[PDB]
Each structure stands twice: as C-alpha cells, then as structure tokens.
Design an enzyme around this catalytic site. Structure first.
Site, PDB file in Angstrom:
ATOM      1  N   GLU A 195      33.777  13.768 -20.482  1.00 51.55           N
ATOM      2  CA  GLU A 195      32.930  13.322 -19.882  1.00 51.55           C
ATOM      3  C   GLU A 195      33.431  12.690 -18.415  1.00 51.55           C
ATOM      4  OE1 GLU A 195      30.259  10.560 -21.302  1.00 51.55           O
ATOM      5  OE2 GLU A 195      28.785  10.192 -19.731  1.00 51.55           O
ATOM      6  N   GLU A 206      22.272   4.040 -15.080  1.00 52.89           N
ATOM      7  CA  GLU A 206      22.213   3.721 -16.544  1.00 52.89           C
ATOM      8  C   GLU A 206      21.740   2.080 -16.387  1.00 52.89           C
ATOM      9  OE1 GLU A 206      26.643   4.651 -18.177  1.00 52.89           O
ATOM     10  OE2 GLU A 206      25.093   5.230 -19.636  1.00 52.89           O
TER      11      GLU A 206
END
Ligand SMILES: *[C@@H]1O[C@H](CO)[C@@H](O)[C@H](O)[C@H]1NC(C)=O
Length: 218
Positions: free
Chosen positions: A116, A200
């Site tokens: 990631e 986020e």
C-alpha cells in the site's frame, strides 16, 4: 450530487467520488459528500462530524480513477496528478491522502494488496500513519517523512508532507521509484491496482473542499 449515505458513489468520465464511510459503525456522527464536477477531473467536497473510537478511521471519502487494465509500475511511464484542496472545521483528526495498492498478480483483489502506497498531503491532529518513521526523503522536489510498516501481510509505505500541501502537482511514479531504488521494492513485478485521493477521518468536525483533483496512468 450530494448524499450522506454510507456507501454513496457518483461516477463519470473515468472518475468516481465515494462517501466510503466504511468505519461509521466505529463512531457517532455523519459524513456527506458532494460531487460538484466529474468533467476534466474530479471536483468535490466532504462534510463530516465524528466522535468516539479515537483511533479508528470512520471514513475515507475519496475520488479515484478507473484502471481497466492493470500494468506494472516499471511499465508505466508517468502517473501525473494535481490536487487543490482546503480543510476547515474544528478539532480535526484526519488526513488528506493518496492511497494505492499494488500486487504481484494483476488480478489480485483490489481492496488489499502486497503493498500500500500512501502520500499524505495533509495531516490534522495526532493521527499517525502505519509503522514507524524512516526519516526524511526528497521526492519530486519536496521533502517527506517516510513511514514503513506492516498492516497484516501487507507492507505500507506512507510519504507524509512536512507541511499541509494544499496545491499539489506530482507524479506518483517518483514515489514508486524511490521505493524501487532505495527499499528493494519490485517495481518490475508490481501492478497498480487502485489510485485514490481523499481524507481518512477519525474525529472532529470537518469540511474538505477539493477544488480539483486529476490523475492518470500513462
Ligand atoms: C496541518 O495544519 C494543521 C492545522 O493548522 C496543523 O495543526 C498540522 O500541524 C498541519 N500538518 C502539517 C503536515 O503541516
């Protein structure tokens, strides 16, 4: 258009804007997303309020591009992107971040990967990326704090801006290259599975305005 539904999506012209309040159950509050334009890039804003679950992400409202055919990092010549955004609100514990998964199998599930890659243009509050700091690194003429760690089997590399970078122009290939050249990352064998940009959100009250976001894989 606007929706506060947990899994709201708006698509067009290769671009998709998603509410993606995947962690809403971990907290209390809401998230609304507005897709203003999907023409010649994505233009959108996210309005939210979250309390509870201090260290759990409630949402990753985001824009992303479709990737009909997966290709290896080394085979891609450029992954240009621009982002113009601002954040307002109060007690904001949230980031502004690119997120990308890669895997050795081009047909790997697109919701996880071998790696990631994250590029945090913004960071609000005391939230912290996965793993621990590797120190400062120069990518694309800008300094980043590079973090590395595992999140399960997956290795996560997060490049965190040292100041909130609200008008950005970049090439994600430069980040893969840094990993290739300094961290033994198999750019030759890794396929780009996703290409997303969003926020986020942990806790607080916030409004992310993304005036424009563009991205491509060439
Ligand atoms: C982003 O701005 C906020 C609010 O002013 C600040 O507290 C935080 O330190 C900033 N983050 C970075 C990476 O400069």
């Amino acid at each position: 258009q606007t929706s506060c539904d947990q899994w709201a999506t708006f698509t067009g012209n290769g671009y998709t804007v998603s509410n993606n309040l995947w962690g809403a159950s971990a907290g209390s509050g809401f998230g609304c997303v507005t897709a203003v334009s999907l023409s010649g890039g994505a233009s959108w804003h996210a309005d939210w309020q979250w309390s509870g679950g201090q260290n759990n992400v409630k949402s990753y409202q985001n824009s992303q591009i479709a990737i009909p055919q997966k290709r290896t990092v080394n085979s891609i010549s450029s992954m240009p992107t621009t982002a113009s955004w601002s954040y307002s609100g109060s007690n904001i514990r949230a980031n502004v971040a690119y997120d990308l998964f890669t895997a050795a199998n081009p047909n790997h599930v697109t919701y996880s990967g071998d790696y990631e890659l994250m590029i945090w243009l913004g960071k609000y509050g005391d939230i912290g990326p996965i793993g621990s700091s590797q120190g400062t690194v120069n990518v694309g003429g800008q300094s980043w704090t590079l973090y590395y760690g595992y999140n399960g089997a997956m290795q996560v590399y997060s490049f965190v801006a040292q100041t909130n970078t609200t008008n950005y122009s970049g090439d994600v290939k430069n980040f893969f290259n840094y990993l290739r050249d300094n961290k033994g990352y198999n750019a030759a064998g890794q396929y780009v599975l996703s290409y997303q940009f969003g926020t986020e959100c942990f806790t607080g009250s916030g409004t992310l305005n993304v005036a424009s976001w563009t991205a491509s894989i060439n």
